[model samples]
Target chain A: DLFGDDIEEIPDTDFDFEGNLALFDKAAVFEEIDTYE
Target chain B: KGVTQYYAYVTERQKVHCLNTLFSRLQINQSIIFCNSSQRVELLAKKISQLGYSCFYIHAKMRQEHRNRVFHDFRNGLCRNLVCTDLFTRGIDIQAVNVVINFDFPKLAETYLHRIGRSGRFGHLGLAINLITYDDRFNLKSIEEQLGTEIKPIPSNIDKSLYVAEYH
Candidate 1:
């Protein structure tokens, strides 16, 4: 009966797509380009 | 040897006109189209070859030798089109890439830049076109607002006689 309680938070099964997307902010790129000019 | 440059950004709806505009004006000879997955890469390469263009795919499921040849022939101009995955962060020179098209929307702005950067390497000017759907329209504005750059529409009435590759 205790076998069912063994899993609580599911130990990570999903990827963070939103977090991944945030890693590339368009402002960072435009700022870099501005440096060259 | 001239160094390379490239312009970027995109959106989508119609497939036929999208393709015609790129081929007719963008001076596409050889390209490395980076899709989100390996399966997508293979699908595009099939249509490209059937359309009477010298095209090949880089599929790891094939013998490693088969995948290797696509890289070589593409460099030699025996094949002018290559469809691939974006994990291409290394191990490739990407010399002959004059046009880079993203048939699918990228999940991240970084991935978008990464895909376009591959073609404009080692002294060549490359063109990058990305296509988005109504669902992904916000991603476009998000990219623009964040990048501090404008994504302009391709002018329809340019002299269509653009660059054509001559293989020896």
Candidate 2:
């Protein structure tokens, strides 16, 4: 239910594995540890 | 006067060795050996008996009657040495005991005290023996530090030729 500075609001139930993995991949653009694994 | 000696070990191999050493030292004897695991007690009892020492065992897995019979035999002098867990450490009285052995280290300091307290009861000047391993060193040290008592190191003179390597 919460929105970020550059992100849109998303429903909880609609959040699936693909969406989560996509979000993680997007966040990895700024974070470094994610690149190692 | 009959001399009774107590020997304790945490491992079955050590227990077997201790039993063998005791049997070799004593001429004709009966022993009550206690082990935490029923399988161990049974196996040890069989092996010890095969070695010509009248041996019996008691564990929690035994039926009440069976346990009672073992205890009765021990009390009646049918068994020279009775090996038992913490069950006989307190509340039960067997005055003929001249020695107490701890086959395993107590989980807590209080349990250790209780195990040793079984002997030297009624001002009997009983002997209590404990066998420690390298892993037990830390816990034993902790207990000793807490009680302001230092555990004497095992004398190198005692041949550990039979010492078995422990595999992690």
Candidate 3:
């Protein structure tokens, strides 16, 4: 084991929605809106 | 369509009033608002402050240190709202933010995507509101088709279950 060596990795949690999109139920929300209207 | 998007067809004069109405109605955890120009960013931020909401602003022209502090403080929830230009558009994520507002609708679809993309980060629920002016209609249609999504006209009442947490 090396003395004073940094081995822990910083976990990456940044969300890049442009590359990979966020998912949600657009249809169900619209359906609810339709019924309400 | 990808996000819970709604468009308020408003006159240029109606922008601030429409924004105020959204503030009155929505349960905003935190909101990131976009304006096309840094000038508008500052102006809108000032207007928000005048309206008595806690607001911060960051733009490309700010000193690096100031920009860092503003963003850091915002992410820490020190402020309830942030106003910014396209400089804040790419690669910045604050999970606490659940609302995104386009005070000035963007000219390009990709830019629009990135602006609204600020919310709903990591697949959590969020809301995006676009204040559309008369001149923005053509760009709106083009963006809708290009992005393969529909931006509906905002309803008289937005059901909170779609965006707000719990309490349902």
Candidate 4:
């Protein structure tokens, strides 16, 4: 049997929409920018 | 006679593969799987059953009756594996189970202990295995250090080279 688990503190800025979308298209602007650095 | 394997993945595919591997290694008895969400439990149950394991899924989204039915099956050994969310981590009793697999590492060490405590009940020797990914290493390491115990690493025999190459 399982129950309530503890919550994690993940920062909002840690998520990058552009970086995630870049996974689908390497030639996209977001992908190019992410790969640049 | 029971072995529970825990696997933490950064992607959905990795989670599915780990679930499949655990189901494949399961004996004729029963197993309880704990996932992060209701949707994940359903998705994993669907994929796992396709691999020839008699699996069922339960989560908070389901009606109480349905959840009860799933619990009944697992308690009676009618189902070989029951996939659920963290709802089954404590208090509820399904003593027939001898192992508990954490599909994803909990955010806290206490939660991890509670999840694994489901098995090895009543003096039975249980096995807890965790599949740690590169991304999970940070938190995994933190937990190990906090607990003052070394988390053993066991390499997966599954051919994950292609998956790693594709992602990398």
Candidate 5:
């Protein structure tokens, strides 16, 4: 298992980048950066 | 696998928040946090210090001796965290470091492999966490397929035993 030579495959949907993108605040990080040096 | 890998889907803005939250939650022995740029390495190092954590940073732009001392001191356990770019990615091994954080995900699969490879050295258990933003989605998928490794979504509560050494 360390080498990952063989393993069960999970569905591609597990990495739902498009759908999950909507849940985060895209601009909040920059806004927070302003509070830093 | 000696290392358990995970990815946190975050926006560029969420990166700092994610990192802070992780610092609060994880039992980091000694951690290496990788950034894409030297500027980011310094900035994040400063941010970590401002947050009251012991932090050190090394990058390509620094003088050779300067980098050497920083690396040496870091290896000697002067600090618990190191923020750096890919400059610190290859060949350097420190068994005390059990956590590796990818603040900015790498573009190439090889880079990703080498970065995470820093952890779990000599068959010891370790943890690798990647902060994935919107722009890194395709690169993430491509890297996963190319490396034949699954980088699962991180859970809300991570088990301390996954990356923490009980005795130390």
Candidate 6:
């Protein structure tokens, strides 16, 4: 029951930490960060 | 008998005041705070530190030794607040954890029970408080029904009713 205004901007968890610290490529991360910012 | 208590509030400031009011009135230690996301965990830990509590966080990214060390420090009361993810959920013992705060309530009833169960352990009385937003207050009802216990909401007595004598 999330509201439009209530939608929180959570930071990117690009890799599944629960999946044994699965990681994302650094280049991909900067690309995503740039797009978001 | 041990009980898992709950609270519902609408806004963020209310949640903060609800906690502050409780702390001002009661003797609290080894309080475990659970938030769903690591950023929120870190954010709350910093807010706690700013409020002058010795607080730290443990999450999935931390090394095994880092998690163990923070757990050790928290257990020894080297720190007063342990804001964490589900990393401390179940399967481990955290002694004398009298208060468990769901700064943000989780969706799954099973998860909710495990989070609250950190206290009231070893046949001891404990309390679980939650800050429920307007959106998710009803989840508490569902969780209560799933657990077969009714969650009593804290009265609007603000600073007064929360002077609950610590469980021995």
Number of the predicted model whose DockQ against the real structure is largest: 5
The CA lDDT of each predicted structure is: 0.53, 0.47, 0.72, 0.54, 0.74, 0.61
lDDT of 1 by residue, B43-92 (tens): 66665554445567775566777767767777788877777776555334
Worst window of 10 by summed lDDT in candidate 6 chain A:
A3-12
Residue range with the least summed lDDT across 10 consecutive positions in model 3 chain B: B116-125
- Which ranges of candidate 3 are over 4 A from the true structure? A1-37, B89-91, B118-122
DockQ for candidate 5, C-alpha atoms: 0.06
TM-score ranking from best candidate downward: 5, 3, 6, 4, 1, 2
Off by over 4 Å in 4: A1-37, B1-12, B26-28, B89-93, B118-123, B155-168
Question: In candidate 2, which residue pairs clash?
Answer: B30-B80, B32-B81, B32-B82, B32-B83, B34-B83
Per-model TM-score, in order, reads 0.60, 0.57, 0.76, 0.62, 0.77, 0.69
Q: Tens digits of per-residue lDDT for model 5 on B28-118?
A: 8899999898887987887777556889899888999999999899999999999988874564458788899998899998788777665
Residue pairs clashing in model 5 are A2-B1, A29-B13
Candidate 6: clashing pairs of residues: none
The better candidate by DockQ, 2 or 6, is: 6
- Native contacts recovered by model 2: 0.00
Over B13-72, each residue of candidate 2 has an lDDT whose tens digit, in order, gives 334454455445422223333355566566656766655567557777889998989888
Tens digits of per-residue lDDT, candidate 3, B37-84, equal 887888788877765688999988889999999989998999899999
Ranking by lDDT: 5, 3, 6, 4, 1, 2
TM-score of model 4 (CA atoms): 0.62
- Model 5: CA > 4 A from native: A1-37, B118-122
lDDT, candidate 1, A1-37, per-residue tens:
1111111322223322233334445456546556765
User: How big an interface RMSD has model 4?
Assistant: 14.0
List the lowest-lDDT window of 10 residues for candidate 2 chain B.
B159-168
Q: Per-residue lDDT for B45-157 in model 6, tens only? A: 77666545678799887789998898888888887778888874463346667677888887878787677664445544566777666555456546766878766554433
DockQ of 3: 0.02
* DockQ of each candidate relative to the true complex: 0.02, 0.01, 0.02, 0.03, 0.06, 0.02
